Design a binder for these strands. Structure first.
Ligand SMILES: [Cl-]
Ligand SMILES: [Cl-]
Ligand SMILES: [Cl-]
Ligand SMILES: [K+]
Ligand SMILES: [Mg+2]
Ligand SMILES: [Mg+2]
Ligand SMILES: [Mg+2]
Ligand SMILES: [Mg+2]
Ligand SMILES: [Mg+2]
Ligand SMILES: [Mg+2]
Ligand SMILES: [Mg+2]
Ligand SMILES: [Mg+2]
Ligand SMILES: [Mg+2]
Ligand SMILES: [Mg+2]
Ligand SMILES: [Mg+2]
Ligand SMILES: [Mg+2]
Ligand SMILES: [Mg+2]
Ligand SMILES: [Mg+2]
Ligand SMILES: [Mg+2]
Ligand SMILES: [Mg+2]
Ligand SMILES: [Mg+2]
Ligand SMILES: [Mg+2]
Ligand SMILES: [Mg+2]
Ligand SMILES: [Mg+2]
Ligand SMILES: [Mg+2]
Ligand SMILES: [Mg+2]
Ligand SMILES: [Mg+2]
Ligand SMILES: [Mg+2]
Ligand SMILES: [Mg+2]
Ligand SMILES: [Mg+2]
Ligand SMILES: [Mg+2]
Ligand SMILES: [Mg+2]
Ligand SMILES: [Mg+2]
Ligand SMILES: [Mg+2]
Ligand SMILES: [Mg+2]
Ligand SMILES: [Mg+2]
Ligand SMILES: [Mg+2]
Ligand SMILES: [Mg+2]
Ligand SMILES: [Mg+2]
Ligand SMILES: [Mg+2]
Ligand SMILES: [Mg+2]
Ligand SMILES: [Mg+2]
Ligand SMILES: [Mg+2]
Ligand SMILES: [Mg+2]
Ligand SMILES: [Mg+2]
Ligand SMILES: [Mg+2]
Ligand SMILES: [Mg+2]
Ligand code: NA
Ligand code: NA
Ligand code: NA
Ligand code: NA
Ligand code: NA
Ligand code: NA
Ligand code: NA
Ligand code: NA
Ligand code: NA
Ligand code: NA
Ligand code: NA
Ligand code: NA
Ligand code: NA
Ligand code: NA
Ligand code: NA
Ligand code: NA
Ligand code: NA
Ligand code: NA
Ligand code: NA
Ligand code: NA
Lengths: 237, 56, 73
RNA sequence: GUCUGUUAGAGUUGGUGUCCUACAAUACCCUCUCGUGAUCUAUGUGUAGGGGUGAAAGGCCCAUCGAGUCCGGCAACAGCU
RNA sequence: UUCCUCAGCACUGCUGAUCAGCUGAGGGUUAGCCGGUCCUAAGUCAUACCGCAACUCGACUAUGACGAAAUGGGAAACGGGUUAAUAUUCCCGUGCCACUAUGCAGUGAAAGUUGACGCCCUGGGGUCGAUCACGCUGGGCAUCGCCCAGUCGAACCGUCCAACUCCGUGGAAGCCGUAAUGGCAGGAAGCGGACGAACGGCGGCAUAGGGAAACGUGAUUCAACCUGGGGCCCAUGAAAAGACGAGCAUAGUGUCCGUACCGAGAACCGACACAGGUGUCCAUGGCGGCGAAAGCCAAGGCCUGUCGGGAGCAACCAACGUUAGGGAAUUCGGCAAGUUAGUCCCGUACCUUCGGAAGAAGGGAUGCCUGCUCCGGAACGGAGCAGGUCGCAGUGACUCGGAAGCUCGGACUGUCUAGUAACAACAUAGGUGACCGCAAAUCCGCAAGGACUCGUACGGUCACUGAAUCCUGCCCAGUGCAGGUAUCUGAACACCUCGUACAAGAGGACGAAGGACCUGUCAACGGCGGGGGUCUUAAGGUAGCGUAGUACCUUGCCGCAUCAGUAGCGGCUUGCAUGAAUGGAUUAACCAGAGCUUCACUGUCCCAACGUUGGGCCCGGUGAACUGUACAUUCCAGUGCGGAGUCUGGAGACACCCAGGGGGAAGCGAAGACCCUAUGGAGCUUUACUGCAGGCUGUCGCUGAGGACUCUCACUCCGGGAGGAGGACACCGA
RNA sequence: CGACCGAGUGGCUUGCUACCUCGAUGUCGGUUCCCUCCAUCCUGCCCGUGCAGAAGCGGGCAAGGGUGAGGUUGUUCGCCU
RNA sequence: AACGACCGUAUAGUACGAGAGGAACUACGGUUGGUGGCCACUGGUGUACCGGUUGUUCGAGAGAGCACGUGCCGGGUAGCC
């Protein structure tokens, strides 16, 4: 047969790449030597093409002009601080230790100094729960209890642009416009609507999958399609 | 639209041109590689054994 | 509201576009001053025509339930 | 991703008309669809053959596609003409 | 080189040729200010590093270079004249930019601004053009007195400034303002001021240039160009060089490449002087009208979509006009053709997601001439009134919907088989399940490495279903996936027994994933019967729908409709063999989608006729191809391998030529696609045979200190660094 | 009117066979246009009758001429006016 | 096939017959299908012709061109049907 669509993806051709050359900045926490003596002023609020959410331009004391992962409620003129002793206000970055327990946080680091990994999409946030001398617990947006190094920095507040998922796209054209700003081939043709040579669920006089959809984890690429290692399916029970 | 005669009309793109090295009109001005002598790709001249009968 | 859609898309879709857009176009109070003059500039961007305060908020609302929580703690 | 519209432009329902050693190895005429958008288009640029590309018809990749073209293996083998 | 000149006709030209894109010989393209050149774009290459058995192979990371001639950015030129052929290039006149030198000025100088930006609505400024009024110059017309052309003049230099913004004054508690939104005691109108636009105005340029002459003045609408206000995004609409910032005189330099011609029904691609294909700008010439529409006419181009001559010019064919009475009787089917039509007033059903349905339907009006009213600044803009008046007909041509109903399907715009399928198929928003916390899930590579990803669960991958509305029942036995697992089974290394002076070998102990076993799961593959008043194999079809695009029997039965209806619709319905996201039922709107009915219309038909244009026929010139074992004037029968111009018996038959429609040569065209055969081929499938990738797991090497545990030192990842996390695991090799 | 059983003719249906053609004899239904057969539907002339008449029923000779229009269905066939 | 067939009238409300009902030979008139020819009559055509009228160009007027091979509308001779 022929290599299936998911196998074409990996090659990384034009159709499958993201429009990087059209993207703005890589939102990462500024690397402060120490002392926390770093502060700056919000200069402008911009739109971010890679996340369909607002972001903010800031001018730091030492002349550094950079774009920042904007939480909800940040306006032009506001003064923001980054460091070990940053004032506990929305929009400020500081290690999980300095952050008081029970406060919503975003752009959380996995390993201290990576610039942030978790909780950075529209309207989400992580919940700081437990503290310790060795490990600080954090409840990620998926509901998982993630243990982290208290040295891992984060920003107080929830990400901006919340509620984007509330309104429907209504028409195909609207999806089209968004899809064009991400690394994805759209629209989507059903495997079942294809020929046998093109996909494992292809072929047949009528449309239906051949074998059952739940495939094994050990399945080879080209064969791994449908419900991947499903612990269960349906809604019943 | 037919793939025959009616599709031959848009053909005004220049590709293969006279070659600076071998003198044949095979230097792809877009690829910058001569399909005859291998100029642009190889320092050695393009040559293969299948260019003649095996025992010749 | 959603009258531009004509007889297309069905009740649910054009009903929610109206409710969302209706609240989006309302008069919102400026966090800076306090005048009801805030307008949307684009996705998640808000600005008071009075004092010129430009800020971040929800996509279709200047303030979201989750954002109002931040202050509590 | 609204309507009428041979504005420009794009498309191709019927006539199973004309042609069928053609004007043409896919043409002609009338009729018909779209015509602010998931729109049409020029030039530049990328993806290569069990591999691309595919709003999926086994469609398309220079009149070549259920595996392009060229040359070589090659004077392939056949109980068949 | 097809461009211009000269000379020709053997070739080429759908005929001819004195002509030519043909043949031969000469000639022709002139730049500081038009392009290239420079800059950067998607992206490309080269060197270095690394991989690879190896390279002309290969991903990343560095550096360098390359990548825009109409159509990205960008220092500077206008007007006139001239040649057989060039021309912002040459000549004449005027002007401009850059660099360098000299000299005066200046010490400023780099922050900043510019280059530099999406889609939709719109105001203001305003040139060319078009038109109107009037005057002048020239032409035309000849019943009048109207009609046409012209009335010119740049770059550049100087100057003027609307909008936006801001300052002072002022002091509004209701006023100010707009096409619209809007504005204000955080200071409104008004007055004053700073900054500040045109490819625009005005002055020079210019007793420059051009015209035979006059060589005008005002106006309306205003492309270009300038400048503002408003709305939209699950979409955010380039970059770099360069310029400004930051004076002036004089002088010098400004090299190199392109420049002819065609740009298409004969200069390009299509074998051709091919009815095909092929990008940009002129979108403002007049009347017309809503209009870049029709029709007609200018400027400008052409008679080369290049063979002619003759015959009331027959038959037949292509396009087409008109047909009395009937009016779909034609046909699978109204296919083909026709009908309707512009604008204004009246008026408008079921259903419906309240948007729509809808131009529903149906009815009326429509010209010209005369004098007028209203809106507006005005139009050579628009809306009406009164009187008169012609025709068969006043959207008089042209332009220009036929209408209504029932059922099926897909919700809708959209996609598709380039070249027989445009659809009900694909896509879609919407619904649903699955995997993954990122050193992730999924995917690409042999490796070095890479896509997703300038992304982080409101994410993105992998699948199914396919708008809305009401819903979506039961089954985990089999298959699949997933979790657990006392016990059973379960490879290799190490270890133990026997064997062998060693080895081969036999057996044993231990036992990972896997399997047995148990459990979960059907919006997971799929299932929802026979019997009787349970049996197979888990369950035994719930709402619905139903003779279905699914019903064999079948033209099922009843009803509607028709003279008559295997059709269509409604009801029934035991469903050969309907049914719930393999989605069920249903639905407004939409459709070159399938079926049926009515009104209107008509040469589809009864049943054909006459006419128009191009061929056909005769004449001059040009001039192929298909096909050909031989013989051949055949017919009726027979015979024959059972489908004969040729054999047999009869019959008929003087030769040749013209036009015709196609009965026969089982006519010509293609080594049958159907079917079978061959120990033929290929694409595809799977619990076919045999194997190869990939995933999981154990073991050995890397690998170190003290059946469960601690540690740091290799090794891995985070960190700029210090350092942090992890750690004998993991990665990699076997 | 006519069972059973018995003897035949045709070559329209159907079945059987595998003679002819696989380097092709173009399909069904329809349409148009021409010739023919008789096992006669009508029309001419006859015979019998359970032939009053009138209307029939059955049979003989006979192929000159005629045998039409429509509704459902692709239909041939067939049902219906 | 150059001709085939039908309806009607007189016969006759007769023959026959209880009645109901109900003929024929013959002679006439017409219809239909087929066939050959002709155009006084009716009809069609009639891009010969004459007229009306819309748009545009020739300045108006007069008189004309184009609008597919008549712009459209009205009438229409001969011939052919
Ligand atoms: Cl999305
Ligand atoms: Cl040029
Ligand atoms: Cl405005
Ligand atoms: K055959
Ligand atoms: Mg990052
Ligand atoms: Mg894309
Ligand atoms: Mg799909
Ligand atoms: Mg398919
Ligand atoms: Mg497969
Ligand atoms: Mg399906
Ligand atoms: Mg092709
Ligand atoms: Mg539209
Ligand atoms: Mg349209
Ligand atoms: Mg392209
Ligand atoms: Mg198929
Ligand atoms: Mg010439
Ligand atoms: Mg000459
Ligand atoms: Mg360059
Ligand atoms: Mg340019
Ligand atoms: Mg010239
Ligand atoms: Mg030139
Ligand atoms: Mg020609
Ligand atoms: Mg008629
Ligand atoms: Mg009919
Ligand atoms: Mg019929
Ligand atoms: Mg039609
Ligand atoms: Mg007025
Ligand atoms: Mg008309
Ligand atoms: Mg049906
Ligand atoms: Mg559709
Ligand atoms: Mg096709
Ligand atoms: Mg279609
Ligand atoms: Mg088609
Ligand atoms: Mg579908
Ligand atoms: Mg979906
Ligand atoms: Mg979804
Ligand atoms: Mg029924
Ligand atoms: Mg279900
Ligand atoms: Mg399905
Ligand atoms: Mg054969
Ligand atoms: Mg076959
Ligand atoms: Mg095979
Ligand atoms: Mg790293
Ligand atoms: Mg034949
Ligand atoms: Mg007989
Ligand atoms: Mg006869
Ligand atoms: Mg004419
Ligand atoms: Na399938
Ligand atoms: Na067509
Ligand atoms: Na291949
Ligand atoms: Na060979
Ligand atoms: Na063989
Ligand atoms: Na000026
Ligand atoms: Na006009
Ligand atoms: Na559309
Ligand atoms: Na089961
Ligand atoms: Na199971
Ligand atoms: Na079922
Ligand atoms: Na469509
Ligand atoms: Na006709
Ligand atoms: Na013949
Ligand atoms: Na095949
Ligand atoms: Na017989
Ligand atoms: Na043959
Ligand atoms: Na036939
Ligand atoms: Na007869
Ligand atoms: Na019938």
């Amino acid at each position: 047969g022929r290599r299936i669509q998911g196998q074409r993806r990996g090659r990384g051709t034009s159709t499958f790449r993201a429009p990087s050359h059209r993207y703005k900045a890589d939102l990462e926490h500024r690397k402060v030597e120490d002392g926390d003596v770093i502060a700056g002023t919000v200069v402008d609020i911009e739109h971010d093409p890679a996340r369909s959410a607002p972001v903010a331009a800031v001018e730091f004391e030492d002349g550094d002009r950079r774009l920042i992962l904007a939480p909800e409620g940040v306006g032009v003129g506001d003064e923001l601080q980054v460091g070990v002793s940053a004032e506990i206000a929305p929009g400020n970055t500081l290690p999980l230790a300095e952050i008081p327990e029970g406060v919503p946080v975003c752009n959380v680091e996995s390993s201290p100094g990576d610039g942030g990994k978790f909780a950075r999409a529209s309207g989400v946030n992580a919940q700081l729960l437990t503290h310790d001398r060795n490990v600080a617990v954090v409840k990620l947006p998926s509901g998982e209890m993630k243990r982290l190094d208290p040295q891992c920095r984060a920003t107080i507040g929830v990400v901006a642009g919340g509620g984007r998922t509330d309104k429907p796209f209504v028409k195909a054209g609207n999806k089209h416009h968004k899809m064009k700003a991400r690394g994805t081939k759209w629209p989507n043709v059903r495997g079942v609507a294809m020929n046998a040579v093109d996909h494992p669920f292809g072929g047949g006089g009528r449309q239906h999958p051949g074998k059952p959809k739940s495939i094994s984890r050990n399945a080879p690429p080209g064969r791994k399609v449908g419900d991947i290692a499903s612990k269960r399916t349906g809604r019943g029970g | 639209t037919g793939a025959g005669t009616p599709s031959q009309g848009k053909k005004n793109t220049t590709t293969h041109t006279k070659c600076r090295r071998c003198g044949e009109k095979s230097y792809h001005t877009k690829k910058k590689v001569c399909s005859s002598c291998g100029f642009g790709k190889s320092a050695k001249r393009r040559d293969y054994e299948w260019q003649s009968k095996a025992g010749e | 509201r959603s009258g531009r859609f004509g007889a297309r898309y069905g009740r649910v879709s054009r009903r929610r576009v109206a409710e969302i857009e209706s609240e989006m176009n309302e008069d919102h109070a400026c966090p800076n001053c306090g005048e009801d003059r805030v307008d949307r500039q684009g996705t998640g961007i808000w600005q008071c025509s009075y004092c010129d305060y430009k800020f971040t908020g929800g996509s279709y609302k200047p303030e979201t339930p989750g954002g109002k929580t931040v202050r509590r703690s």
